[PDB]
């Protein structure tokens, strides 16, 4: 079985991340380590790279984007900045 972004139990708890994007404001997250993935469904990156968080409804995996493309990635890898750019 592949990476399960699924979370099938219920729609459990999360911090107020999705609610920071609601303004129309753009939330960022700096990558702590390289994310190596050869899955076009997932978003690979390098350390120090700033990722725009699009969806963080699930705890384990979030949907992000770079100037290149978009896809899933594990939250663990990333440190999000709550303030301005």
């Amino acid at each position: 079985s592949s990476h399960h972004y699924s979370h099938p139990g219920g729609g459990g708890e999360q911090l107020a991340i999705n609610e920071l994007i609601s303004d129309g404001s753009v939330v960022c997250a700096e990558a702590l380590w390289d994310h190596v993935t050869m899955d076009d469904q997932e978003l690979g990156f390098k350390a120090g790279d700033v990722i725009e968080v699009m969806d963080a409804t699930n705890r384990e995996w979030w949907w992000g984007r770079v100037a290149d493309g978009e896809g899933w990635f594990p939250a663990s890898f990333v440190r999000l900045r709550v303030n301005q750019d």
Binding site: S6, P8, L15, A16, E19, V82, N83
Partner: protein, 406 residues
């Protein structure tokens, strides 16, 4: 009544270094109780504003007495912001009282909502890391933040003013973070019956951003809620408010948070399950979600909607009218397509919903056979995931009992 307790705590705070032994002797919870007093039960603990001004000052002394330890810098920064909030709420209750009751209101004071917005802003932003949350929880942050949101809602109900919306959004987010993974906090917020009604009432707002903020609070609260919390969420009609909200939301991110909250609530009891089906056009809408692909996290709403239905399907099964509302919206067809899905959540939901609906109805038993469900369920009876394997084989058992042709 018992001001003398508040009175004595300030007097012990008077000496510059005896504040250290107080926190050590366990005074911070005692001080917060005089300020808020959560522990109490309805029909068998907070002090008067006179005693509250004594207590909040005594708090200020204990927290400021410690060295420039990382905790110190944190607690001073937070308490300062909490003091701003507590002072503003005191202005509110001072206007709320003596201005609303039967007494003569010909006396010069209204609190300006503008000043407190940057104050919550910081608190909300700081609540995004564990370290400040723990600091807030030692200083009764949740309570102070909640009491603010409530008192504001009790003043301008459903106001649609930009400066007021921002405030309610900011406080709500702070409540979301502080409830997240915090058993003790979830129960406290649920004990604030007034504030709980204030939050639910906010779902009628025409600011979908705030609606999203409210759903997120309710979602957190409905996850691993204790017996009381579950009871409270049901009693305030949060289920009814949320399902009624879902039918009238345009922005999908707002919908994402709402269905997610309902999915949690739907599991709690049959009474909550009945509440969803009682809302007109609700079931129809939930069926619509089964084929709604989102912009980001493309399978979000199908998972959310499928799950809510999976939970209520057991109640739907007995109702012939509700089975028809589904039939009208090609429900069984869609669920059959959900078995082909690549998602654990979706596949599981399908043969969960198909489990319930396959039994005790010859009407839909015929249909599934005429759809060729057998072949698709047969492909999942030996599934690696045991719930999917169970649900399918159970639904296959239901159908195999009823066959018209070989």
């Amino acid at each position: 009544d018992k001001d003398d307790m508040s009175r004595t705590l300030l007097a012990m705070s008077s000496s510059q270094d005896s504040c250290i032994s107080m926190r050590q002797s366990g005074c911070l919870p005692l001080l917060i109780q005089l300020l808020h007093g959560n522990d109490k039960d309805s029909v068998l603990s907070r002090g008067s504003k006179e005693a509250r001004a004594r207590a909040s000052a005594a708090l200020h002394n204990i927290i400021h007495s410690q060295p420039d330890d990382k905790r110190g810098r944190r607690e001073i920064r937070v308490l300062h912001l909490l003091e701003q909030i507590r002072a503003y709420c005191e202005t509110c209750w001072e206007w709320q009282e003596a201005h609303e009751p039967g007494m003569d209101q010909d006396k010069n004071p209204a609190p300006v909502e503008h000043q407190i917005c940057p104050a919550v802003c910081v608190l909300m932003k700081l609540s995004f890391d564990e370290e400040h949350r723990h600091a807030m929880n030692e200083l009764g942050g949740l309570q102070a933040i909640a009491e603010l949101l409530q008192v504001d809602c009790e003043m301008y109900g459903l106001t649609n003013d930009h400066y007021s919306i921002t405030l309610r959004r900011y406080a709500g987010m702070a409540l979301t973070n502080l409830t997240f993974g915090d058993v003790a906090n979830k129960a406290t917020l649920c004990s604030m019956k007034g504030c709980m009604r204030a939050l639910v009432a906010q779902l009628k707002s025409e600011s979908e951003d705030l609606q999203q903020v409210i759903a997120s609070v309710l979602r957190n609260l409905s996850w691993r809620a204790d017996v009381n919390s579950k009871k409270t969420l049901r009693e305030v009609g949060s289920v009814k408010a949320l399902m009624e909200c879902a039918l009238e939301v345009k922005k999908e991110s707002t919908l994402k948070s709402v269905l997610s909250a309902l999915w949690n609530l739907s599991a709690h009891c049959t009474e909550n399950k009945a509440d969803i089906c009682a809302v007109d056009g609700a079931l129809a809408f939930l069926v619509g979600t089964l084929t709604y692909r989102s912009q980001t996290n493309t399978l979000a709403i199908i998972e959310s909607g499928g799950g809510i239905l999976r939970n209520v399907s057991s109640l739907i099964a007995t109702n012939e009218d509700h089975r028809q509302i589904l039939r009208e919206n090609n429900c069984l067809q869609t669920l059959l397509q959900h078995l082909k899905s690549h998602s654990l959540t979706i596949v599981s939901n399908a043969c969960g919903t198909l489990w319930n609906l396959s039994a005790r109805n010859p009407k839909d038993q015929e249909a599934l056979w005429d759809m060729g469900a057998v072949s698709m369920l047969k492909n999942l009876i030996h599934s690696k995931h045991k719930m999917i394997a169970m649900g399918s084989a159970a639904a296959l058992r239901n159908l195999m009992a009823n066959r018209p042709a070989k």
